[PDB]
Each structure stands twice: as C-alpha cells, then as structure tokens.
mmCIF file of N, CA, C and O in Angstrom:
data_model
loop_
_atom_site.group_PDB
_atom_site.id
_atom_site.type_symbol
_atom_site.label_atom_id
_atom_site.label_comp_id
_atom_site.label_asym_id
_atom_site.label_seq_id
_atom_site.Cartn_x
_atom_site.Cartn_y
_atom_site.Cartn_z
ATOM 1 N N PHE A 347 -25.911 2.161 2.168
ATOM 2 C CA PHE A 347 -25.353 2.014 2.997
ATOM 3 C C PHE A 347 -25.589 3.150 4.160
ATOM 4 O O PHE A 347 -26.671 3.786 3.978
ATOM 5 N N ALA A 348 -25.196 2.925 5.695
ATOM 6 C CA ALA A 348 -25.647 3.636 6.344
ATOM 7 C C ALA A 348 -25.519 5.309 6.123
ATOM 8 O O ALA A 348 -24.021 5.167 6.233
ATOM 9 N N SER A 349 -25.473 5.975 7.441
ATOM 10 C CA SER A 349 -25.192 7.641 7.422
ATOM 11 C C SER A 349 -23.403 7.497 8.320
ATOM 12 O O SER A 349 -22.641 6.110 8.143
ATOM 13 N N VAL A 350 -22.823 8.302 8.528
ATOM 14 C CA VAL A 350 -21.846 8.560 9.069
ATOM 15 C C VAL A 350 -22.077 8.787 10.485
ATOM 16 O O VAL A 350 -20.794 7.825 11.153
ATOM 17 N N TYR A 351 -22.659 9.054 10.494
ATOM 18 C CA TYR A 351 -22.949 9.041 12.399
ATOM 19 C C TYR A 351 -23.373 7.840 13.402
ATOM 20 O O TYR A 351 -24.242 7.201 14.335
ATOM 21 N N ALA A 352 -23.979 7.192 12.312
ATOM 22 C CA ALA A 352 -24.508 5.659 12.137
ATOM 23 C C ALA A 352 -24.163 4.333 11.353
ATOM 24 O O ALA A 352 -25.065 3.676 10.761
ATOM 25 N N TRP A 353 -22.623 4.472 11.746
ATOM 26 C CA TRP A 353 -22.080 3.340 10.693
ATOM 27 C C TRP A 353 -22.334 1.903 10.808
ATOM 28 O O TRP A 353 -22.261 2.066 11.823
ATOM 29 N N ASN A 354 -22.276 1.134 9.443
ATOM 30 C CA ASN A 354 -22.270 0.209 9.893
ATOM 31 C C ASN A 354 -21.094 -0.593 10.287
ATOM 32 O O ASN A 354 -20.101 -0.322 9.650
ATOM 33 N N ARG A 355 -21.340 -0.938 11.388
ATOM 34 C CA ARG A 355 -20.159 -1.896 11.826
ATOM 35 C C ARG A 355 -20.019 -3.596 12.150
ATOM 36 O O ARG A 355 -21.419 -4.280 12.215
ATOM 37 N N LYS A 356 -19.260 -4.359 10.860
ATOM 38 C CA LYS A 356 -19.787 -6.150 10.790
ATOM 39 C C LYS A 356 -18.577 -6.206 11.305
ATOM 40 O O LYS A 356 -17.186 -5.831 11.225
ATOM 41 N N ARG A 357 -18.609 -7.495 11.463
ATOM 42 C CA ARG A 357 -18.143 -8.350 12.248
ATOM 43 C C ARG A 357 -17.153 -9.561 11.578
ATOM 44 O O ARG A 357 -18.197 -10.442 10.857
ATOM 45 N N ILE A 358 -16.230 -10.205 11.288
ATOM 46 C CA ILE A 358 -15.549 -10.792 10.489
ATOM 47 C C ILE A 358 -14.990 -11.889 10.822
ATOM 48 O O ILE A 358 -13.789 -11.957 11.804
ATOM 49 N N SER A 359 -14.878 -13.557 11.073
ATOM 50 C CA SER A 359 -14.106 -14.234 12.049
ATOM 51 C C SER A 359 -14.380 -15.932 10.994
ATOM 52 O O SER A 359 -15.680 -15.729 10.970
ATOM 53 N N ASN A 360 -13.468 -17.100 11.563
ATOM 54 C CA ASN A 360 -13.734 -18.109 10.661
ATOM 55 C C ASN A 360 -13.774 -18.260 9.676
ATOM 56 O O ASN A 360 -14.882 -18.701 8.901
ATOM 57 N N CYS A 361 -12.813 -18.102 8.425
ATOM 58 C CA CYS A 361 -13.266 -17.953 6.769
ATOM 59 C C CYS A 361 -11.626 -17.010 5.814
ATOM 60 O O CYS A 361 -11.023 -16.392 7.145
ATOM 61 N N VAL A 362 -11.743 -17.520 5.254
ATOM 62 C CA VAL A 362 -10.482 -17.223 4.405
ATOM 63 C C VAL A 362 -11.190 -15.881 3.568
ATOM 64 O O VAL A 362 -12.150 -16.072 2.988
ATOM 65 N N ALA A 363 -9.932 -14.837 3.750
ATOM 66 C CA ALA A 363 -10.645 -13.793 3.024
ATOM 67 C C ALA A 363 -9.068 -13.109 2.031
ATOM 68 O O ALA A 363 -7.726 -12.643 2.509
ATOM 69 N N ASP A 364 -9.534 -13.174 0.464
ATOM 70 C CA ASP A 364 -8.678 -12.569 -0.262
ATOM 71 C C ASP A 364 -8.781 -11.558 -0.776
ATOM 72 O O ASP A 364 -9.858 -10.984 -1.105
ATOM 73 N N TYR A 365 -7.859 -10.569 -0.628
ATOM 74 C CA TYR A 365 -7.138 -9.287 -0.508
ATOM 75 C C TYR A 365 -6.872 -8.594 -1.936
ATOM 76 O O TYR A 365 -7.008 -7.637 -2.197
ATOM 77 N N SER A 366 -6.075 -9.750 -2.441
ATOM 78 C CA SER A 366 -5.980 -9.453 -3.740
ATOM 79 C C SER A 366 -7.215 -9.139 -4.700
ATOM 80 O O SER A 366 -6.202 -8.290 -5.471
ATOM 81 N N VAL A 367 -7.927 -9.416 -4.690
ATOM 82 C CA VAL A 367 -8.719 -9.785 -5.756
ATOM 83 C C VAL A 367 -9.367 -7.968 -5.036
ATOM 84 O O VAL A 367 -9.341 -7.096 -6.571
ATOM 85 N N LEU A 368 -9.588 -7.590 -3.948
ATOM 86 C CA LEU A 368 -9.781 -6.253 -3.912
ATOM 87 C C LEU A 368 -8.748 -5.001 -3.980
ATOM 88 O O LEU A 368 -9.287 -4.413 -4.365
ATOM 89 N N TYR A 369 -7.414 -5.464 -3.891
ATOM 90 C CA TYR A 369 -6.301 -5.107 -4.428
ATOM 91 C C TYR A 369 -6.141 -4.756 -5.787
ATOM 92 O O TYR A 369 -6.032 -3.283 -6.174
ATOM 93 N N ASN A 370 -6.783 -5.494 -6.340
ATOM 94 C CA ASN A 370 -6.279 -5.332 -8.163
ATOM 95 C C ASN A 370 -7.532 -4.947 -8.682
ATOM 96 O O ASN A 370 -6.937 -4.423 -9.691
ATOM 97 N N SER A 371 -8.530 -4.241 -7.812
ATOM 98 C CA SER A 371 -9.985 -4.166 -8.225
ATOM 99 C C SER A 371 -9.425 -2.354 -8.564
ATOM 100 O O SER A 371 -8.848 -1.914 -7.907
ATOM 101 N N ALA A 372 -9.700 -1.960 -9.423
ATOM 102 C CA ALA A 372 -9.885 -0.608 -10.121
ATOM 103 C C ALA A 372 -10.807 0.417 -10.374
ATOM 104 O O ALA A 372 -10.884 1.685 -10.033
ATOM 105 N N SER A 373 -12.115 -0.121 -9.381
ATOM 106 C CA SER A 373 -13.158 0.716 -8.920
ATOM 107 C C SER A 373 -13.215 1.798 -7.888
ATOM 108 O O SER A 373 -13.986 2.169 -7.732
ATOM 109 N N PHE A 374 -12.219 1.744 -6.661
ATOM 110 C CA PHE A 374 -12.219 2.060 -5.910
ATOM 111 C C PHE A 374 -10.638 2.759 -5.530
ATOM 112 O O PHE A 374 -9.817 3.181 -6.241
ATOM 113 N N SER A 375 -11.401 4.478 -5.825
ATOM 114 C CA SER A 375 -11.276 5.738 -5.836
ATOM 115 C C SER A 375 -9.390 5.700 -5.171
ATOM 116 O O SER A 375 -8.823 6.622 -5.095
ATOM 117 N N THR A 376 -9.800 5.256 -3.573
ATOM 118 C CA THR A 376 -9.033 5.256 -2.430
ATOM 119 C C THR A 376 -8.696 4.003 -1.783
ATOM 120 O O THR A 376 -9.594 3.935 -1.553
ATOM 121 N N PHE A 377 -7.040 3.472 -2.040
ATOM 122 C CA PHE A 377 -7.020 2.175 -1.262
ATOM 123 C C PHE A 377 -5.793 2.825 -0.218
ATOM 124 O O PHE A 377 -4.207 2.501 -0.844
ATOM 125 N N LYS A 378 -5.276 3.049 1.067
ATOM 126 C CA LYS A 378 -5.101 3.038 1.770
ATOM 127 C C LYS A 378 -4.875 2.167 2.566
ATOM 128 O O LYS A 378 -5.846 2.541 3.797
ATOM 129 N N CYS A 379 -3.958 2.004 2.769
ATOM 130 C CA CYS A 379 -3.158 1.083 4.381
ATOM 131 C C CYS A 379 -2.138 1.950 4.869
ATOM 132 O O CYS A 379 -1.534 1.921 4.587
ATOM 133 N N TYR A 380 -1.975 1.990 6.642
ATOM 134 C CA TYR A 380 -1.525 2.510 7.191
ATOM 135 C C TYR A 380 -0.688 1.601 7.986
ATOM 136 O O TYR A 380 0.873 1.907 8.019
ATOM 137 N N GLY A 381 -1.403 0.869 8.946
ATOM 138 C CA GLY A 381 -0.195 -0.354 9.719
ATOM 139 C C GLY A 381 0.454 -1.115 9.100
ATOM 140 O O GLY A 381 1.679 -1.584 9.132
ATOM 141 N N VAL A 382 -0.106 -1.907 7.757
ATOM 142 C CA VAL A 382 0.453 -2.834 6.747
ATOM 143 C C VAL A 382 0.740 -2.592 5.526
ATOM 144 O O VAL A 382 -0.307 -2.026 5.272
ATOM 145 N N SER A 383 1.592 -2.704 5.096
ATOM 146 C CA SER A 383 1.877 -2.944 3.366
ATOM 147 C C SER A 383 0.538 -4.005 2.516
ATOM 148 O O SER A 383 0.559 -4.995 3.154
ATOM 149 N N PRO A 384 -0.220 -3.302 1.778
ATOM 150 C CA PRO A 384 -0.842 -3.831 1.521
ATOM 151 C C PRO A 384 -0.736 -5.169 0.987
ATOM 152 O O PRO A 384 -1.139 -6.371 0.666
ATOM 153 N N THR A 385 0.335 -5.380 0.477
ATOM 154 C CA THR A 385 0.838 -6.172 -0.595
ATOM 155 C C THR A 385 1.256 -8.288 0.596
ATOM 156 O O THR A 385 0.916 -9.176 0.031
ATOM 157 N N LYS A 386 1.812 -7.811 1.551
ATOM 158 C CA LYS A 386 1.449 -9.113 2.747
ATOM 159 C C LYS A 386 0.844 -9.417 3.293
ATOM 160 O O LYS A 386 0.635 -9.997 4.900
ATOM 161 N N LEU A 387 -0.878 -9.116 3.508
ATOM 162 C CA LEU A 387 -1.480 -9.458 3.843
ATOM 163 C C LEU A 387 -2.403 -10.583 4.342
ATOM 164 O O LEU A 387 -2.519 -11.442 5.108
ATOM 165 N N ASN A 388 -1.686 -11.357 2.882
ATOM 166 C CA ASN A 388 -2.113 -12.742 2.278
ATOM 167 C C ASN A 388 -1.180 -13.750 3.267
ATOM 168 O O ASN A 388 -1.551 -14.753 3.375
ATOM 169 N N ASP A 389 0.021 -12.777 3.852
ATOM 170 C CA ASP A 389 1.296 -14.038 4.559
ATOM 171 C C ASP A 389 0.602 -13.771 6.089
ATOM 172 O O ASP A 389 0.143 -15.195 6.591
ATOM 173 N N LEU A 390 0.496 -12.839 6.835
ATOM 174 C CA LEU A 390 0.418 -12.423 8.237
ATOM 175 C C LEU A 390 -1.343 -12.774 8.583
ATOM 176 O O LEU A 390 -2.423 -11.494 7.574
ATOM 177 N N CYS A 391 -1.659 -13.253 9.521
ATOM 178 C CA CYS A 391 -2.896 -12.710 9.872
ATOM 179 C C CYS A 391 -3.576 -12.732 10.885
ATOM 180 O O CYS A 391 -2.290 -12.983 12.457
ATOM 181 N N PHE A 392 -4.809 -12.204 11.798
ATOM 182 C CA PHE A 392 -5.365 -12.375 13.128
ATOM 183 C C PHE A 392 -6.310 -12.645 13.068
ATOM 184 O O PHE A 392 -6.580 -13.603 12.740
ATOM 185 N N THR A 393 -6.745 -12.680 14.907
ATOM 186 C CA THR A 393 -8.285 -13.250 14.910
ATOM 187 C C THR A 393 -9.531 -12.540 15.086
ATOM 188 O O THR A 393 -10.395 -13.693 14.923
ATOM 189 N N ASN A 394 -9.283 -11.688 14.239
ATOM 190 C CA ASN A 394 -11.024 -10.826 14.058
ATOM 191 C C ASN A 394 -10.821 -9.622 13.378
ATOM 192 O O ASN A 394 -9.208 -9.369 12.866
ATOM 193 N N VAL A 395 -11.608 -9.306 12.210
ATOM 194 C CA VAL A 395 -11.756 -8.558 11.580
ATOM 195 C C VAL A 395 -13.184 -7.421 11.879
ATOM 196 O O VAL A 395 -14.108 -8.070 11.867
ATOM 197 N N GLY B 446 6.325 26.921 6.458
ATOM 198 C CA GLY B 446 5.867 26.601 5.394
ATOM 199 C C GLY B 446 5.657 25.308 5.122
ATOM 200 O O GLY B 446 5.186 24.995 4.761
ATOM 201 N N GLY B 447 6.501 24.852 5.662
ATOM 202 C CA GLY B 447 7.035 22.962 5.927
ATOM 203 C C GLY B 447 8.357 22.832 4.623
ATOM 204 O O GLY B 447 8.311 23.052 3.450
ATOM 205 N N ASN B 448 9.354 22.504 5.234
ATOM 206 C CA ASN B 448 10.262 22.105 3.737
ATOM 207 C C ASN B 448 10.326 20.704 3.607
ATOM 208 O O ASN B 448 9.613 19.850 4.011
ATOM 209 N N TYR B 449 10.631 20.429 2.029
ATOM 210 C CA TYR B 449 10.307 19.594 1.419
ATOM 211 C C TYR B 449 11.087 18.664 0.687
ATOM 212 O O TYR B 449 11.462 17.809 -0.003
ATOM 213 N N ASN B 450 12.681 19.525 1.064
ATOM 214 C CA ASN B 450 13.907 18.819 0.634
ATOM 215 C C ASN B 450 14.319 17.817 0.887
ATOM 216 O O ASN B 450 15.127 16.795 0.272
ATOM 217 N N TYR B 451 14.144 17.188 2.260
ATOM 218 C CA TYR B 451 14.553 15.623 2.624
ATOM 219 C C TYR B 451 13.566 14.820 2.151
ATOM 220 O O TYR B 451 12.199 14.754 2.579
ATOM 221 N N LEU B 452 13.540 13.437 1.465
ATOM 222 C CA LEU B 452 13.067 12.637 0.173
ATOM 223 C C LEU B 452 13.286 10.990 1.351
ATOM 224 O O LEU B 452 14.728 10.906 2.285
ATOM 225 N N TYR B 453 12.281 10.253 1.259
ATOM 226 C CA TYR B 453 12.410 8.816 1.681
ATOM 227 C C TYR B 453 11.927 8.700 0.989
ATOM 228 O O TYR B 453 11.210 9.007 0.198
ATOM 229 N N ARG B 454 12.487 6.857 0.374
ATOM 230 C CA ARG B 454 11.955 6.200 -0.495
ATOM 231 C C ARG B 454 10.543 5.264 0.293
ATOM 232 O O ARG B 454 11.373 4.542 1.437
ATOM 233 N N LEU B 455 9.695 4.412 0.267
ATOM 234 C CA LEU B 455 8.162 3.994 0.446
ATOM 235 C C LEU B 455 8.656 2.920 -0.260
ATOM 236 O O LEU B 455 7.909 1.727 0.235
ATOM 237 N N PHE B 456 8.503 3.121 -1.200
ATOM 238 C CA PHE B 456 8.526 1.799 -2.313
ATOM 239 C C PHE B 456 9.844 1.111 -2.326
ATOM 240 O O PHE B 456 10.713 1.881 -3.326
ATOM 241 N N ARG B 457 9.934 -0.326 -2.449
ATOM 242 C CA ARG B 457 10.509 -0.858 -2.662
ATOM 243 C C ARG B 457 10.438 -2.290 -3.334
ATOM 244 O O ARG B 457 10.008 -3.117 -2.610
ATOM 245 N N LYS B 458 11.321 -3.273 -4.668
ATOM 246 C CA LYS B 458 11.348 -4.545 -4.708
ATOM 247 C C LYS B 458 11.394 -4.979 -4.160
ATOM 248 O O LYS B 458 10.853 -6.617 -3.561
ATOM 249 N N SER B 459 12.840 -5.028 -2.859
ATOM 250 C CA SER B 459 12.818 -5.992 -2.061
ATOM 251 C C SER B 459 14.150 -5.265 -0.805
ATOM 252 O O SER B 459 13.497 -4.273 -1.015
ATOM 253 N N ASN B 460 14.435 -6.021 -0.002
ATOM 254 C CA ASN B 460 15.543 -5.051 1.110
ATOM 255 C C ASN B 460 16.603 -4.619 0.564
ATOM 256 O O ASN B 460 17.113 -5.287 -0.362
ATOM 257 N N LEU B 461 17.519 -4.673 1.253
ATOM 258 C CA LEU B 461 19.073 -3.367 0.925
ATOM 259 C C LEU B 461 20.015 -4.459 1.850
ATOM 260 O O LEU B 461 19.793 -4.821 3.206
ATOM 261 N N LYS B 462 21.131 -4.577 1.614
ATOM 262 C CA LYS B 462 22.002 -5.296 1.788
ATOM 263 C C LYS B 462 22.559 -4.046 2.696
ATOM 264 O O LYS B 462 22.239 -3.197 2.749
ATOM 265 N N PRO B 463 23.783 -4.886 3.966
ATOM 266 C CA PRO B 463 23.770 -3.672 4.489
ATOM 267 C C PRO B 463 25.554 -2.853 4.219
ATOM 268 O O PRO B 463 25.946 -3.349 2.880
ATOM 269 N N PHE B 464 24.636 -1.785 4.539
ATOM 270 C CA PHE B 464 26.119 -0.936 3.941
ATOM 271 C C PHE B 464 25.558 -0.620 2.175
ATOM 272 O O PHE B 464 26.524 -1.267 1.490
ATOM 273 N N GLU B 465 24.801 -0.508 1.892
ATOM 274 C CA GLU B 465 24.535 0.039 0.369
ATOM 275 C C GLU B 465 23.258 1.223 0.580
ATOM 276 O O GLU B 465 22.627 1.045 0.933
ATOM 277 N N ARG B 466 23.568 1.846 -0.817
ATOM 278 C CA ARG B 466 22.990 2.882 -1.245
ATOM 279 C C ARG B 466 22.533 2.768 -2.075
ATOM 280 O O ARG B 466 22.765 2.375 -3.243
ATOM 281 N N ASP B 467 20.638 3.293 -2.417
ATOM 282 C CA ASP B 467 19.846 3.112 -3.894
ATOM 283 C C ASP B 467 19.474 4.404 -4.008
ATOM 284 O O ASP B 467 18.627 5.359 -3.133
ATOM 285 N N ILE B 468 20.111 4.792 -4.676
ATOM 286 C CA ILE B 468 19.103 6.013 -5.201
ATOM 287 C C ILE B 468 18.516 6.027 -7.090
ATOM 288 O O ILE B 468 17.886 6.824 -7.953
ATOM 289 N N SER B 469 17.928 5.068 -7.450
ATOM 290 C CA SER B 469 17.220 4.808 -8.248
ATOM 291 C C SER B 469 15.994 5.545 -8.036
ATOM 292 O O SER B 469 15.538 4.816 -7.301
ATOM 293 N N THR B 470 15.320 5.947 -9.171
ATOM 294 C CA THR B 470 14.266 7.055 -9.027
ATOM 295 C C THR B 470 13.426 6.258 -9.946
ATOM 296 O O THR B 470 13.269 7.212 -10.645
ATOM 297 N N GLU B 471 12.399 5.483 -9.910
ATOM 298 C CA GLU B 471 11.601 4.704 -10.916
ATOM 299 C C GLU B 471 10.583 4.284 -10.528
ATOM 300 O O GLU B 471 10.115 4.178 -8.671
ATOM 301 N N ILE B 472 9.533 4.545 -11.379
ATOM 302 C CA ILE B 472 7.926 3.861 -11.061
ATOM 303 C C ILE B 472 8.364 2.523 -10.456
ATOM 304 O O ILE B 472 9.225 2.015 -11.165
ATOM 305 N N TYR B 473 6.871 2.239 -9.678
ATOM 306 C CA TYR B 473 7.081 1.308 -8.831
ATOM 307 C C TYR B 473 5.875 0.296 -9.521
ATOM 308 O O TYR B 473 4.688 1.065 -9.345
ATOM 309 N N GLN B 474 5.538 -1.200 -9.579
ATOM 310 C CA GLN B 474 4.677 -1.694 -10.270
ATOM 311 C C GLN B 474 4.296 -2.126 -9.102
ATOM 312 O O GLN B 474 4.325 -2.936 -8.327
ATOM 313 N N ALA B 475 3.071 -1.364 -8.221
ATOM 314 C CA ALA B 475 2.455 -1.126 -6.982
ATOM 315 C C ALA B 475 1.687 -2.491 -7.103
ATOM 316 O O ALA B 475 1.856 -3.726 -6.591
ATOM 317 N N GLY B 476 0.897 -2.727 -8.204
ATOM 318 C CA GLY B 476 -0.334 -3.444 -8.325
ATOM 319 C C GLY B 476 -0.148 -4.838 -9.512
ATOM 320 O O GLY B 476 1.204 -4.789 -10.565
ATOM 321 N N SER B 477 -1.038 -5.527 -9.944
ATOM 322 C CA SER B 477 -1.067 -6.434 -10.560
ATOM 323 C C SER B 477 -0.958 -5.561 -12.250
ATOM 324 O O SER B 477 -0.411 -5.988 -13.244
ATOM 325 N N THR B 478 -1.058 -4.685 -12.242
ATOM 326 C CA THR B 478 -1.426 -3.353 -13.618
ATOM 327 C C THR B 478 0.169 -3.066 -14.337
ATOM 328 O O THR B 478 0.796 -2.332 -13.364
ATOM 329 N N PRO B 479 0.643 -3.157 -15.142
ATOM 330 C CA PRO B 479 1.695 -2.573 -15.167
ATOM 331 C C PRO B 479 1.700 -1.107 -15.748
ATOM 332 O O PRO B 479 0.925 -0.309 -15.578
ATOM 333 N N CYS B 480 2.987 -0.698 -15.345
ATOM 334 C CA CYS B 480 3.079 1.018 -15.440
ATOM 335 C C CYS B 480 3.486 1.294 -16.781
ATOM 336 O O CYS B 480 3.219 1.990 -17.759
ATOM 337 N N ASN B 481 4.232 0.787 -17.179
ATOM 338 C CA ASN B 481 5.531 0.890 -18.452
ATOM 339 C C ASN B 481 5.489 2.782 -18.841
ATOM 340 O O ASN B 481 5.950 3.073 -20.183
ATOM 341 N N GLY B 482 5.987 3.014 -17.626
ATOM 342 C CA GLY B 482 6.363 4.270 -17.383
ATOM 343 C C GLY B 482 5.438 5.563 -16.957
ATOM 344 O O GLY B 482 5.947 6.665 -17.001
ATOM 345 N N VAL B 483 4.501 4.807 -17.161
ATOM 346 C CA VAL B 483 3.463 5.775 -16.984
ATOM 347 C C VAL B 483 2.781 5.318 -15.266
ATOM 348 O O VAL B 483 2.625 3.902 -15.468
ATOM 349 N N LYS B 484 2.163 5.934 -14.218
ATOM 350 C CA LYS B 484 1.680 5.978 -12.888
ATOM 351 C C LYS B 484 0.375 5.058 -13.257
ATOM 352 O O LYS B 484 0.128 3.646 -12.667
ATOM 353 N N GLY B 485 -0.379 6.132 -13.357
ATOM 354 C CA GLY B 485 -1.772 5.492 -13.923
ATOM 355 C C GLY B 485 -2.540 5.267 -11.964
ATOM 356 O O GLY B 485 -2.485 6.174 -11.357
ATOM 357 N N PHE B 486 -2.544 3.727 -12.593
ATOM 358 C CA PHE B 486 -3.101 3.260 -11.074
ATOM 359 C C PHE B 486 -2.529 2.158 -10.786
ATOM 360 O O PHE B 486 -1.914 1.469 -11.696
ATOM 361 N N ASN B 487 -2.235 1.767 -9.306
ATOM 362 C CA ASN B 487 -0.946 0.697 -8.760
ATOM 363 C C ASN B 487 0.302 0.925 -9.065
ATOM 364 O O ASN B 487 0.957 0.371 -9.302
ATOM 365 N N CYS B 488 0.729 2.342 -9.691
ATOM 366 C CA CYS B 488 1.961 2.484 -9.859
ATOM 367 C C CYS B 488 2.057 4.031 -8.832
ATOM 368 O O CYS B 488 1.251 4.949 -9.329
ATOM 369 N N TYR B 489 2.931 4.088 -8.107
ATOM 370 C CA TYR B 489 3.126 5.643 -7.324
ATOM 371 C C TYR B 489 5.377 5.449 -7.279
ATOM 372 O O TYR B 489 5.553 4.832 -7.154
ATOM 373 N N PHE B 490 5.223 7.005 -7.027
ATOM 374 C CA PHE B 490 6.521 7.312 -7.435
ATOM 375 C C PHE B 490 6.978 6.583 -5.919
ATOM 376 O O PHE B 490 6.511 7.042 -4.304
ATOM 377 N N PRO B 491 7.986 6.271 -5.483
ATOM 378 C CA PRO B 491 8.914 5.804 -4.389
ATOM 379 C C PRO B 491 9.370 6.607 -3.303
ATOM 380 O O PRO B 491 8.789 6.013 -1.970
ATOM 381 N N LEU B 492 9.613 7.845 -3.780
ATOM 382 C CA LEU B 492 9.917 9.091 -2.717
ATOM 383 C C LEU B 492 9.118 9.563 -2.637
ATOM 384 O O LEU B 492 8.242 10.446 -3.527
ATOM 385 N N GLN B 493 9.185 10.451 -1.283
ATOM 386 C CA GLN B 493 8.329 11.536 -1.164
ATOM 387 C C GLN B 493 8.563 12.407 0.123
ATOM 388 O O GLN B 493 10.014 11.892 0.930
ATOM 389 N N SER B 494 8.348 13.505 0.283
ATOM 390 C CA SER B 494 9.085 14.274 1.119
ATOM 391 C C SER B 494 8.683 14.112 2.724
ATOM 392 O O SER B 494 7.802 13.246 2.818
#
C-alpha cells in the first residue's frame, strides 16, 4: 500500500460487487458505514465507486 | 462535560408501527455471526447516548 499523503485512488465501474463477503469477514478491525446501513448496500446502488 | 443520559436506538430488526414504543435492550445480530448473548464481533448494543 502507498503512504497517506500519496494515497492510492481507484475507480470501480461496470461490474457486480458483493459487499456481503467483505462484511462477514472478521479480519477487519474497523468497518464503519456513515451514509447508509451496511445491510442494504446489495439493494440500492450508484454509478461509480 | 457532555451529558449521556439521553439515549437513542440505532439497530433494530424492522421498523415501527405508528404510535408504538419499544424498550427492549437486547444485543442485535448485526452480521451472520451469532451473538448468543455476547457482543464479540458483528453484534452491537442497539442503544447509544
């Protein structure tokens, strides 16, 4: 991974993304969602990530 | 110093019927991992100040 003043920025578009597998992973120390509840990402969706 | 006697519930299984009050303070199975009375991971207390 890169540094904090040179953080890596990635664009995601035109694919199906399964957030359930990441949400069920226990290796993440912190998993905080502010705008929306983590449960309902698989229902609503946007045009870019 | 910050008062914390004022609580609100953020996690619930479903919505509320009109004119209904719920005071059930029980751990919520946020993720696929069962809680079994222990928060651990993927379980959080519904109420916070």
